[PDB]
Amino acid sequence: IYQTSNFRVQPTESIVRFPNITNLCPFGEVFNATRFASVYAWNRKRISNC
Amino acid sequence: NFTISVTTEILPVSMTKTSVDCTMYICGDSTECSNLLLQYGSFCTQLNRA
Numbered sequence A: 001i002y003q004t005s006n007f008r009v010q011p012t013e014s015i016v017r018f019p020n021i022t023n024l025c026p027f028g029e030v031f032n033a034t035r036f037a038s039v040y041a042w043n044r045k046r047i048s049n050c
Numbered sequence B: 001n002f003t004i005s006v007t008t009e010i011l012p013v014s015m016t017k018t019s020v021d022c023t024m025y026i027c028g029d030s031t032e033c034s035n036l037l038l039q040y041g042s043f044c045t046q047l048n049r050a
């Protein structure tokens, strides 16, 4: 008797799921912005749920 | 006067015969890490054979 290899059964399709939201994250305007914060006082921005 | 005192003598015979898959344990059934593992030596055969 000889254990040759494993028996890892392949998947039969793929499933993807995500938060069920459509909000966008305000990123582009941040880079477009001429107004900008300082370095010794760098600004914080809690981006979430987008 | 004499006596008989039957006593128990316990002896191990067979420890649970374990077998470990060489690559299922090391790689979670992926594509690149399996190649990287086979890039190593003949350890899949060595450990499984032992």
Ligand SMILES: *[C@@H]1O[C@H](CO)[C@@H](O)[C@H](O)[C@H]1NC(C)=O
Residues within 6 Å of the ligand: A020
């Ligand atoms: C979740 O998304 C599906 C598909 O877009 C939609 O039919 C359903 O109403 C959504 N439910 C919630 C709670 O967002």
Ligand SMILES: *[C@@H]1O[C@H](CO)[C@@H](O)[C@H](O)[C@H]1NC(C)=O
Residues within 6 Å of the ligand: A027, A028, A029, A031, A032
């Ligand atoms: C604003 O920023 C976005 C993201 O970096 C960039 O794609 C776009 O070209 C920028 N707009 C201008 C006018 O520079």
Ligand SMILES: *[C@@H]1O[C@H](CO)[C@@H](O)[C@H](O)[C@H]1NC(C)=O
Residues within 6 Å of the ligand: B001, B002, B003
């Ligand atoms: C020897 O010991 C046993 C153990 O109980 C006992 O039953 C028996 O009577 C003894 N023999 C004598 C001669 O006392």
